[PDB]
Design an enzyme around this catalytic site. Structure first.
Site, mmCIF file in Angstrom:
data_model
loop_
_atom_site.group_PDB
_atom_site.id
_atom_site.type_symbol
_atom_site.label_atom_id
_atom_site.label_comp_id
_atom_site.label_asym_id
_atom_site.label_seq_id
_atom_site.Cartn_x
_atom_site.Cartn_y
_atom_site.Cartn_z
ATOM 1 N N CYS A 37 0.827 -1.201 0.000
ATOM 2 C CA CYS A 37 0.000 0.000 0.000
ATOM 3 C C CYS A 37 0.865 1.256 0.000
ATOM 4 C CB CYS A 37 -0.927 0.005 1.217
ATOM 5 S SG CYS A 37 -2.389 1.053 1.026
ATOM 6 N N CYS A 63 2.203 10.158 0.068
ATOM 7 C CA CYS A 63 2.134 10.839 -1.220
ATOM 8 C C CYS A 63 0.903 10.395 -2.005
ATOM 9 C CB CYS A 63 3.398 10.563 -2.034
ATOM 10 S SG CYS A 63 3.384 11.288 -3.690
ATOM 11 N N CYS A 106 -7.412 0.051 0.794
ATOM 12 C CA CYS A 106 -7.291 1.416 1.294
ATOM 13 C C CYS A 106 -8.469 1.771 2.196
ATOM 14 C CB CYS A 106 -7.210 2.403 0.128
ATOM 15 S SG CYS A 106 -5.526 2.899 -0.304
#
Length: 128
Positions: A37, A63, A106
């Site tokens: 991830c 980022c 996520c």
């Protein structure tokens, strides 16, 4: 875990944005991440004597575009109990913002990060 060229970040030299200035003898912190991830979910919380979330903070780290999975889980925990928040399921956070099929994981980190804070709070009063 590689070198990961993306450390030491600063947004125009902020002033502890997304923090409640140290702990409050009742603040839980939840940090989670993944190798594939390449990111980290850090969120703050504030519980009272009763055991209900009265305050919820969040810090940036990674980022990428503005993560809604974090801003969503935060507004949800704000005013929720320890069990309630810990009861939240990634499925709710997934359909909430309809995350992309790229890395649905996520969404699991969003509900897993908030829990990490609830488990940290109980540890603050478990040893004292």
């Amino acid at each position: 875990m590689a070198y990961s060229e993306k450390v030491i970040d600063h947004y125009e030299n902020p002033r502890n944005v997304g923090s409640f200035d140290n702990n409050d003898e009742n603040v839980g912190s939840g940090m989670v991440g993944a190798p594939a991830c390449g990111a980290v979910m850090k969120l703050q919380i504030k519980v009272n004597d009763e055991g209900i979330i009265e305050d919820a903070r969040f810090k940036t780290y990674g980022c990428g575009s503005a993560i809604a999975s974090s801003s969503l889980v935060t507004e949800w925990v704000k005013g929720k109990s320890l069990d309630e928040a810990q009861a939240i399921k990634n499925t709710d956070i997934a359909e909430e913002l309809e995350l992309p099929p790229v890395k649905i994981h996520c969404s699991i980190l969003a509900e897993d990060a908030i829990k990490a804070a609830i488990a940290d709070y109980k540890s603050k009063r478990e040893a004292k």
